[PDB]
Amino acid sequence: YEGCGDLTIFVAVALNKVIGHKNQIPWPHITHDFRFLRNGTTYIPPEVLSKNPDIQNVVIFGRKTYESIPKASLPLKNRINVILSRTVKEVPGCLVYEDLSTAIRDLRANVPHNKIFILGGSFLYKEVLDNGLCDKIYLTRLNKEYPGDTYFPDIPDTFEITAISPTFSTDFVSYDFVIYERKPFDQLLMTGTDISVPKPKYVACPGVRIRNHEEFQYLDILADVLSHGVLKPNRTGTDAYSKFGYQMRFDLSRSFPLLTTKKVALRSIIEELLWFIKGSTNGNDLLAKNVRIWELNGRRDFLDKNGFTDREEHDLGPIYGFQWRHFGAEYLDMHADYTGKGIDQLAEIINRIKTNPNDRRLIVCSWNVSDLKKMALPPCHCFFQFYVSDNKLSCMMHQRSCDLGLGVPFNIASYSILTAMVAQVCGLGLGEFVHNLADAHIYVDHVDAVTTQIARIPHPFPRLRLNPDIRNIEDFTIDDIVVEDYVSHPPIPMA
Amino acid sequence: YEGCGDLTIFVAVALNKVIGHKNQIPWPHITHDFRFLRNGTTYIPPEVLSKNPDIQNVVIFGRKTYESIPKASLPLKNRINVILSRTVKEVPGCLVYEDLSTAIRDLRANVPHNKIFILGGSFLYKEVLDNGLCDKIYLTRLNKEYPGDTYFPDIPDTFEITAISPTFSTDFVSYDFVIYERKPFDQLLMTGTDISVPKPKYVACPGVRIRNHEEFQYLDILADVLSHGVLKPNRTGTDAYSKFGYQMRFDLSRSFPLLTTKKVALRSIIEELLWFIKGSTNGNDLLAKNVRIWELNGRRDFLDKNGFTDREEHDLGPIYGFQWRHFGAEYLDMHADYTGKGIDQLAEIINRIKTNPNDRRLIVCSWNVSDLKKMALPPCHCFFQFYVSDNKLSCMMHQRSCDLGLGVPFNIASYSILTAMVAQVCGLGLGEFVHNLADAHIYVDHVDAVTTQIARIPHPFPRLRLNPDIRNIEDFTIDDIVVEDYVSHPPIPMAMSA
Ligand SMILES: NC(=O)c1ccc[n+]([C@@H]2O[C@H](COP(=O)([O-])OP(=O)(O)OC[C@H]3O[C@@H](n4cnc5c(N)ncnc54)[C@H](OP(=O)(O)O)[C@@H]3O)[C@@H](O)[C@H]2O)c1
Ligand SMILES: NC(=O)c1ccc[n+]([C@@H]2O[C@H](COP(=O)([O-])OP(=O)(O)OC[C@H]3O[C@@H](n4cnc5c(N)ncnc54)[C@H](OP(=O)(O)O)[C@@H]3O)[C@@H](O)[C@H]2O)c1
């Protein structure tokens, strides 16, 4: 295989590694992937094009893949098409070779071209990888298994992912684009400070250089806090490393930001959010769903410790649910009837959005200063604001205190669901969830867990499908809130 | 001067162009300037260091600059030292030549080196600039005038600034660094969007490639909203271009972020803040001090159309001052005595910081949901949070509605002052102000004004000095709050909408 190196693969691959089914693409057409491939395989570096505007890229197929592309526009526009086979003679306007070894040498010695791309057949992928002729793989990752009979071979441990696109979705699949690859001083000087700054002790996925997956926002914050956070002790309790002031954003029209670097407990997230929506302050309602994230905060021991000796177990006081639905009402206990008492911020914001989406006062505030002394924990996600433009709903949330290990992944998914529900009930499209972190911290007993997590390569985000028949926010149940195509690394226990 | 070009200058220059006084530097030691010069003139690119591990840069001095240097400090370590002189013939560890052109030609022919730098003095700087021999100037900008007898030449209009550092400060000056210069496809593909995208229509300071001055955060947001904001109707009747969700941050230990690309009305900012702190909602208090920023919001027409027909003119309702000092009290009018009524959020947060810097309640909230029906205009900077780490105070503020042209420059300065005050009264150093913008918009009648603004090169930020005797936040007066070394471009008229 002398002179046959530096071959570049383009391929789209289902979760079970299937690439073909009965000589056809196993999934419905993804126009975005057609365009991606077209763009990747037609690019000529300007300085090459400027000395001969004729120069073109080579695109190589196995026989069956050629016969699989519609017999109409088979010669792919603006590219040299090459097909390989030990049986077929010659193809209309396409170079035909017996084997790959000979194909590459003939093109590289005789035919003026820029770059060679390997575009399909498991047979052709196999030879290329098995011998080491590929330096680069552009791979479209699909988060769903499909029936098929043709598969992409395993990628040798000699490759690593160096690039991940943002996550995208169609009505039927979520997906992204990745690149696998084998294996200026003024910018430093003009910080005005130390030119030889020690490398941060922690870096998320240090092999990935083009980092466009939205999950890197969260992983980078994890690495930042471990690297630079100040230790905040607490007597009676677990210490944490802390750093202040971050902003993340998630495009909710593209995908649903359920973290993939660990298996996140979606069911608990949804049940907690439905409980907020109903205005509940009764921790038993969550326990009945075997959701235990609020349990420790409702216990006899914890309540007494905080002065609420007269308060029934799992009566959490005037927390989120109460503020969302009854801001300003006098809190009694979790059993009281608050109908028509206080301000229903959630109802009012939905009505306001419908009535005047340009209102600059679309806010729900859970920071009820007068009520703080009746909660054992002050609200954490304490203020959010909606915004409408081009008929798309966005949301910005202020998180006072951010448990990065356990809490923040819940908040990201929770507010994303809430934004989608509100958009649906108000007849709006989806914009962005913008997440402001104030005190962002990592508990010291989570250090090892998050060190493990930041090394893991994000999978494409899943996508959210709400039941389209739900007209009112109070009508959503867990069965109406469906996350599709969630692919995650294993769960990481955190106390 | 054949073969004598591409000489790089390092210099530190006062606001009046002074660089020397009685053959010494006119100002005392500037910490980051010393490191900048040392780092800038010793650096060898790793690849160049591969092909010659012993390679060094050259630094060149004229005779008077040479004599200003303690003989024991020469040669400057890790660099080839060249002195230009007809009167000194030999300097241990240094090369001596009679003039510049002889030096550069002999260096480039016979003395292997990486880059040549010119370190002064004025005579050499003038020879270099007059003869077109310099392609790059690393210049330290000091934001105040110094007495002196020695000057840096005017920089030819063939140069432009291509890089600006963050602002730094000592006890005596604020300063920054600038560079003047004479004049991959996968990254595009892997966005997953159009590979060929038209350039944004608006770009702040397009000649500046390294953009580390904190003011660029604000200028970039103006340019982003002008480029991509949606035209959006609002309460005022003057439409604005609007985009959602930004975060800026300012290191308050280094400088005070009073914008330099227009002259900002600092006196108005200070008077407004003192008014918040005293808990006042009486707009006449500000008008009596010739501060008119709240005027339109207090007028009869405004109050009536928001249904406050029984409200006295310039009674601004239960806004910031009231919420900061009296949260939950019953608002009557601007004349009532609210002493010991409602929750004094400002006093409590200061006490909490002193008692426990890690308190879970370090918030001042001006969004009193129960009070919304009593307000003609609800608080825009409606929520802020303090945070302590390493005995330094930081602040994060949520701004629901951001008039980018007129309002945001005030907010930036106002919260930075407030953070400095709280830090002083709690015995803390300074961290960062983090400013979160929700609906950020440019009124249509400010578009031309901000277009003018974003083409202006920022000056180093000034610095803030509070009267250290003040121990209680209520005791600050305007005379206690002093901004030093403020250099700005001219003011830019912008009309207020209400
Ligand atoms: N999702 C994707 O990214 C993607 C991309 C491309 C293709 N596909 C799918 O994959 C399937 C087709 O792939 P396939 O593996 O069945 O067939 P293939 O590799 O396209 O072609 C097989 C035939 O081509 C010839 N050939 C292939 N590799 C050769 C080599 N290395 N050396 C010499 N000859 C070689 C052989 O010739 P003879 O038998 O003629 O002697 C062989 O029978 C289709 O279902 C297609 O839709 C999917
Ligand atoms: N703020 C800053 O960054 C900075 C930087 C540099 C200097 N400075 C200050 O500026 C002052 C020194 O500058 P300066 O203008 O007074 O003097 P200078 O340029 O340092 O030195 C003047 C002397 O240098 C010699 N010289 C320079 N170019 C020559 C050439 N082409 N051929 C022959 N001789 C040449 C002459 O030598 P002979 O007369 O011996 O023949 C002349 O008397 C000091 O106060 C210093 O602290 C400040």
CATH assignment at residue A126: 3.40.430.10
Number of H helices, E strands in chain B: 14, 20
Question: CB within 8 A of A158, min separation 6: which ones?
Answer: A132, A182, A183
Q: Are residues A228 and A313 in the same domain?
A: yes
State how far the Cα of B457 lies from the Cα of B446, in Å rounded to an integer: 19
Specify the DSSP element, H or E, that contains B164. strand B159-164
Residues with CB under 6 A from ligand 2: B 11-12, 19-20, 23-25, 62-65, 68, 84-87, 98-100, 119-124, 127, 150
Tokens coding B472:
């209680």
Cα within 13 Å of Cα(A211), Cβ side: 14
Token look-up 């070394």 returns: B485
Whether the CB-CB separation of B113 and B89 falls below 8 Å is answered with no
Please tell me which residue of chain B has the smallest CA distance to A391: B230
Q: Are residues B200 and B160 in the same domain?
A: no
Whether the CB-CB separation of A351 and A371 falls below 8 Å is answered with no
Tokens coding B5:
């070009």
DSSP assignment string, A321-342: HHHHHHBTSPP--TTS--TT-S
Q: Are residues A161 and A223 in the same domain?
A: no
State how far the Cα of A196 lies from the Cα of A188, in Å rounded to an integer: 9
Any CB–CB contact under 8 A between B234 and chain A? yes
Number of cross-chain residue pairs from A and B with Cβ atoms under 8 Å apart: 182
Whether the CB-CB separation of B237 and B453 falls below 8 Å is answered with no
Q: Are residues B191 and B91 in the same domain?
A: no
Whether the CB-CB separation of A247 and B394 falls below 8 Å is answered with no
Ligand number with the minimum distance to the CA of B120 = 2
Whether the CB-CB separation of A401 and A441 falls below 8 Å is answered with yes
The residue type of A402 is C
Question: CB within 8 A of A198, min separation 6: which ones?
Answer: none
| Strand ranges, E, within B333-472 | 363-365, 381-389, 392-403, 429-443, 463-466
Closest by CA to B495, choosing from B456, B442, B418, is: B442
Closest by CA to A439, choosing from B391, B360, B423, is: B360
Catalytic residue (choose from A380, A382, A402, A426): A380
Q: Are residues A247 and A375 in the same domain?
A: yes
Last residue of a domain, one of B141, B168, B183: B183
The residue type of B63 is R
Question: SS3 for A332?
Answer: coil
CB atoms near residue B103 (< 10 Å): 21
Cβ–Cβ gap A396/B177 under 8 Å: no
Q: Are residues A128 and A195 in the same domain?
A: no
Please tell me which residue of chain A has the smallest CA distance to B229: A389
Closest by CA to B189, choosing from A139, A78, A75, is: A139
Closest by CA to B20, choosing from B130, B124, B155, B147, is: B147
Question: CB within 8 A of B444, min separation 6: which ones?
Answer: B231, B238, B239, B240, B241
Q: Are residues A322 and A241 in the same domain?
A: yes
Whether the CB-CB separation of A420 and A457 falls below 8 Å is answered with no
CB atoms near residue B206 (< 10 Å): 11
Cβ–Cβ gap B43/A385 under 8 Å: no
- Say if residue A112 is preceded by a cis peptide, omega within 30 of 0: no
- Say if residue B245 is preceded by a cis peptide, omega within 30 of 0: no
Closest by CA to B207, choosing from B166, B164, B161, is: B161
Last residue of a domain, one of B183, B204, B236: B183
Residue A361's φ and ψ, nearest 5 degrees, are -120, 30
Question: CB within 8 A of A475, min separation 6: which ones?
Answer: none
Any CB–CB contact under 8 A between A347 and chain B? no
Distance from CA of B78 to the nearest CA of A (A): 16
Bridge partners, residue B393, by sequence: B388, B430
Binding site membership of A29 for ligand 1 (Cβ less than 6 Å):
no
Q: How many residues are listed for chain B in this entry?
A: 498
Whether the CB-CB separation of A133 and A60 falls below 8 Å is answered with no
Any CB–CB contact under 8 A between A237 and chain B? no
Closest by CA to A4, choosing from A129, A119, A92, A112, is: A129
Instruction: Give the domain extent around B37.
Output: 1-183
Q: Are residues A172 and A204 in the same domain?
A: no
Å resolution of this model? 2.0
The count of domains in chain B is: 3
CA B46 to chain centre: 33
Q: Are residues B341 and B196 in the same domain?
A: no
Q: Are residues B165 and B273 in the same domain?
A: no
CB atoms near residue B120 (< 10 Å): 24
Experimental method: X-ray
Q: Are residues A459 and A478 in the same domain?
A: yes
Q: ∠ CA B115-B119-B120 to the nearest 5 degrees?
A: 140
Question: CB within 8 A of A313, min separation 6: which ones?
Answer: A283, A298, A299, A300, A303
Q: Are residues A230 and A174 in the same domain?
A: no
Q: Which of residues 243-302 of A touch B (CB under 8 A)?
A: 243-247, 249
Of A32, A389, A400, the CB nearest to B232: A389
- B395: annotated active-site residue: no
DSSP assignment string, A144-191: S----SEEPPPPPTTEEEEEEPPPEE-SS-EEEEEEEEE--HHHHHTT
Chain breaks in chain A (C to N over 2.5 A) after: 183
